Amino acid sequence: TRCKLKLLRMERIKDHLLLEEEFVSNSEILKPFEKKQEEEKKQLEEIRG
């Protein structure tokens, strides 16, 4: 039982903290590049209708 838990200890914390990170980070990815990336998005958008 206590051997199972050692494995169970790492597994829960680390991935569920990364999940909580990725969720917040969806927004955050846009923020450092928003004038190369939205500039590119604009020009992409304009030609293809």
């Binding site: 199972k4 050692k6 494995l7 200890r9 597994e11 680390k14 990725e22 923020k31 990336q37």
Partner: protein
């Protein structure tokens, strides 16, 4: 099932399935009328017990519920548990399962809640008798089958776990809480816990921890020692006992904060010491990092035996294994005092014998060169460093160096680093000093300085036993007043001795590192060296280093580079401790400036290490804050801000890295990914912040020892070709190195594509070239790990110079630093009294099966490979000894440890 009366004994059991006539009517009436009939009840107790046992086979909820329904009432309704005082107390044995039948077999939410509390009280009172222990026992070792008992027996056990946990969270404790109604301590439940522990250790693995961690005391653990040390060999073998023990520290490793975690690991060490294998003792003593525990195991073999025996040889081997050299210094001199033989013993402890074994391995691996043939401009400088990077460790490439042509064509800072790279050819070797000497007595001061760096690197493999120590050479240079000479000298001294804090080495470095009034950029090396020296052992948090940092901030702020190196140096110094580092966070923060805040976030990581989950969230809120503040508006400063931002990014990564090594072991995949996303927040929050986070990612991986090494470095690499700073590639390759030319090929093609393809600056090109040669060592000569290898939870001391350099934009000055990259792992060989240099056979194992381990005690099946192979990195790390069929017995158990094998043939 159906009633069939008293025709035979078989049908009596069927009769009492629906309605008992010897437990319900008779007994009930009896108790509620005469009190001469207490004597009849006492005899009938034995009969009642048997009827439970026979009908334990039956499992259906209905025919336990209803049957014992009116007995459950009788506790308070008729008997009241005091109409005959002793007599209901000792008749609580059949009535206690009756209560459990409504708890667990039937689920009625109102009664399941309420009777949990009742069960706790009556468990406590009946454990005074010691018959509540026996009640648990008949279900723990079983007598009969039902689905019911397998869940039910835990409900009794859970009562104990419940209360003990609650006394910490809620300060009131005891029976004042109505959630158990049972007192926390007192000599009525304490004796119950000890007896319970005995039975559950034998048959289970269960309540034995719940009790330890809930007590929160090392005392709980020291009781555990007593019982287990009896069990060590007669009940089951040494090995089985051990798997419980190293586990004692590991399951709650990542959930004992600093004062608790150390106090528990003391006890696991002591259990091992008591048991047969001292091999298990040494591993835990290294873990603690305390000087005291190391000495005790070394003393235990050396001192009692007058004769040389196996015992002196074994002592020397055990201390030799840590290439920190912390164990090396301590163990020396006892050998001298005893005086059986000086000559064999002193050499064997030192890293001098590790030089000799390397030659045997090298013979197999041979030499293959692939170094760049480019000359002229910055391409000359690139190629000359690259030669040293491919010939790391002991290698012979004398003749190329002796062709002084290309050597002299280096210029400026290039000269210093060129001489330093020559030293890494003879890394971990006594000979090589000759090449360095020539340049040192001629030409400009620049080559003189580079010679001293090279001495540092070479002296790594020989600095113990008073056989050409680095101290001896380098003291003269410190005395000399020139800044370049002195700065180079103390850098090399720190590298060579590593974690060794010998009196001569330490005390040379003690008055110095206290001038920062004078503005010298290259006086970073003052604190940087001392920080390196400190790691590998418990830290005094030296007053010399703390004072000079503060003084530097007062004096200057013009040299941004200087103060950034200084900040890191404090945080690296404190490594090897975390208890004491909680104190010094406050001390630094006493004097407050925005510049001082940069230092604080770094030191927070070390204090909180192996505990970081408060640390993690902190280092993420910090990231958010600049932007968050801009948000508010949306609806001298230069130096302070930049130091602020950069420190945080470094700190975030560092926190994660130290944490992932020590902790549990599954989670390692996950922690690498936390970086990718930290960078991702960064990918559209700070533009400036991206530059720092790129470089950090590679050393995140190397420190963390990630399981996956194929996909993630390569994928990240492609994105970062476009992005500025080619120093990103250097940091990736230190991870990718692994077992050579498994992982590291994909790196050679990928890094080689961007480098060869794009030339648009010879500056950019230089970083890319150095990274490629680092990654591979020809024919698996050696491997580099940040980790000790002796412990896979460990962390080195020689690899901390690698970790330092990724916090700053690339510079020619930085190139001199990067030549140093020490961190060697030895290839194991089965030793004899004549010092045999060949291993017979080993099993190598990519992935441990065992769910009875994390680390994985190597499986006994394995895949078999030949003699004289390097200890394989990831996807090979568990290593089992095959020697048993040729009947050879390891004296020194090896699980994929760094440690050289030793075998006794009889």
């Amino acid at each position: 099932m159906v009633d069939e009366s008293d025709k035979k004994q078989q049908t009596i059991d069927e009769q009492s399935q629906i309605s008992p006539e010897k437990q319900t009517p008779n007994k009930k009436d009896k108790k509620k009328e005469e009190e001469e009939q207490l004597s009849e009840e006492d005899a009938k107790l034995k009969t009642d017990l048997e009827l439970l046992v026979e009908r334990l086979k039956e499992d259906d909820s209905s025919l336990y519920e209803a049957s014992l329904n009116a007995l459950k009432e009788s506790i308070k309704n008729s008997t009241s548990s005091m109409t005959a005082v002793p007599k209901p107390l000792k008749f609580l044995r059949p009535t206690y399962p009756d209560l459990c039948s409504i708890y667990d077999k039937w689920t009625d939410p109102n009664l399941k809640s309420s009777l949990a509390d009742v069960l706790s009280i009556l468990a406590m009172t009946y454990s005074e008798n010691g018959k509540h222990d026996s009640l648990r026992y008949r279900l723990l070792s079983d007598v009969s089958d039902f689905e019911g008992w397998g869940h039910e027996y835990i409900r009794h056990l859970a009562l104990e776990i419940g209360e003990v946990y609650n006394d910490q969270v809620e300060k009131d404790a005891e029976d004042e809480t109505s959630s158990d109604g049972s007192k926390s301590d007192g000599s009525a439940a304490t004796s119950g816990f000890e007896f319970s522990k005995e039975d559950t250790l034998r048959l289970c693995l269960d309540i034995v921890p719940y009790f330890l961690k809930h007590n929160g005391e090392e005392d709980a653990v020291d009781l555990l020692l007593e019982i287990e040390s009896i069990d060590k060999l007669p009940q089951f073998v040494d090995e089985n006992t051990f798997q419980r023990v190293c586990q004692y520290m590991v399951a709650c490793v990542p959930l004992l904060p600093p004062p608790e975690d150390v106090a528990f690991l003391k006890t696991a060490y002591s259990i091992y010491l008591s048991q047969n294998e001292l091999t298990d003792a040494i591993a835990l003593a290294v873990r603690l990092g305390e000087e005291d525990m190391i000495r005790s195991v070394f003393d235990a073999t050396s001192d009692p035996v007058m004769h040389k025996q196996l015992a002196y040889i074994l002592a020397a081997q055990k201390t030799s294994f840590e290439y920190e050299g912390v164990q090396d210094i301590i163990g020396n001199g006892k050998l001298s005092e005893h005086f059986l033989y000086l000559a064999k013993e002193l050499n064997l402890t030192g890293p001098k014998v590790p030089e000799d074994i390397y030659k045997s391995h090298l013979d197999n691996s041979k030499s293959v060169f692939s170094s760049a043939g480019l000359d002229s401009a910055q391409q000359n400088l690139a190629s000359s460093f690259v030669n040293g990077f491919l010939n790391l460790g002991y290698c012979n490439d004398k003749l190329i160096v002796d062709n002084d042509n290309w050597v002299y064509k280096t210029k400026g800072d290039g000269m210093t680093s060129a001489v330093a790279s020559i030293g890494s050819i003879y890394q971990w070797n006594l000979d090589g000093l000759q090449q360095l000497d020539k340049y040192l007595y001629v030409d400009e001061p620049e080559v003189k300085a580079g010679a001293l760096l090279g001495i540092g690197i070479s002296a790594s493999g020989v600095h113990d036993g008073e056989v050409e120590p680095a101290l001896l050479l380098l003291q003269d240079y410190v005395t000399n007043p020139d800044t370049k000479i002195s700065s180079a000298a103390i850098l090399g001294l720190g590298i060579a001795f590593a974690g060794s804090k010998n009196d001569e080495v330490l005390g040379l470095l003690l008055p110095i590192a206290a001038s920062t009034d004078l503005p010298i950029e290259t006086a970073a090396m003052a604190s940087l060296a001392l920080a390196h020296v400190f790691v590998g052992t418990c830290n005094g948090d030296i007053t010399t280093s703390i004072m000079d940092n503060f003084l530097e901030r007062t004096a200057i702020e013009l040299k941004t580079d200087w103060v950034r190196f200084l900040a890191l140096a404090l945080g690296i110094l404190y490594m090897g401790q975390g208890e004491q580092v909680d104190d010094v966070l406050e001390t630094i923060s006493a004097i407050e400036h925005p510049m001082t805040s940069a230092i604080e976030v770094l030191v927070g990581s070390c204090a909180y290490t192996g505990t970081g989950d408060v640390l993690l969230i902190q280092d993420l809120l910090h990231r958010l804050t600049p932007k968050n503040v801009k948000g508010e508006e949306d609806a001298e400063i230069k130096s302070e801000e930049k130091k602020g931002k950069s420190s945080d990014k470094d700190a975030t990564t560092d926190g994660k890295n130290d944490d992932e090594e020590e902790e549990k072991e599954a989670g390692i995949v996950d922690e690498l990914a936390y970086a990718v996303l930290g960078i991702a927040l960064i990918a559209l929050g700070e533009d400036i912040g991206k530059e720092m986070s790129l470089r950090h990612f590679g050393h995140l991986m190397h420190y963390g020892n990630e399981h996956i090494r194929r996909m993630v470095p390569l994928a990240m690499g492609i994105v970062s070709v476009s992005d500025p700073q080619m120093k990103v590639f250097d940091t990736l390759t230190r991870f990718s190195h692994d077992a050579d030319l498994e992982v590291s090929m994909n790196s050679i093609f990928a890094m080689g594509l961007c480098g060869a393809g794009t030339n648009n600056a010879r500056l950019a090109q230089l970083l890319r070239q150095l990274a490629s040669y680092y990654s591979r060592e020809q024919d698996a000569l050696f491997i580099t790990r940040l980790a000790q290898g002796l412990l896979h939870l460990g962390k080195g001391t020689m690899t901390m110079d690698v970790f330092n350099d990724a916090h700053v934009l690339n510079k020619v000055t930085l190139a001199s630093i990067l030549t140093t990259a020490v961190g060697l792992v030895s290839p194991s060989f089965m030793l004899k009294h004549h010092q045999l240099f060949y291993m017979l056979n080993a099993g190598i194992r990519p992935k441990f099966i065992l769910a009875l381990n994390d680390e994985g005690e190597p499986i006994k099946v394995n895949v078999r490979v030949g003699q004289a192979v390097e200890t394989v990195g990831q996807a090979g790390r568990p290593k089992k000894i095959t020697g048993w069929i040729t009947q050879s017995t390891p004296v020194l158990l090896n699980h994929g440890e760094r440690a050289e094998l030793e075998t006794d043939e009889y």
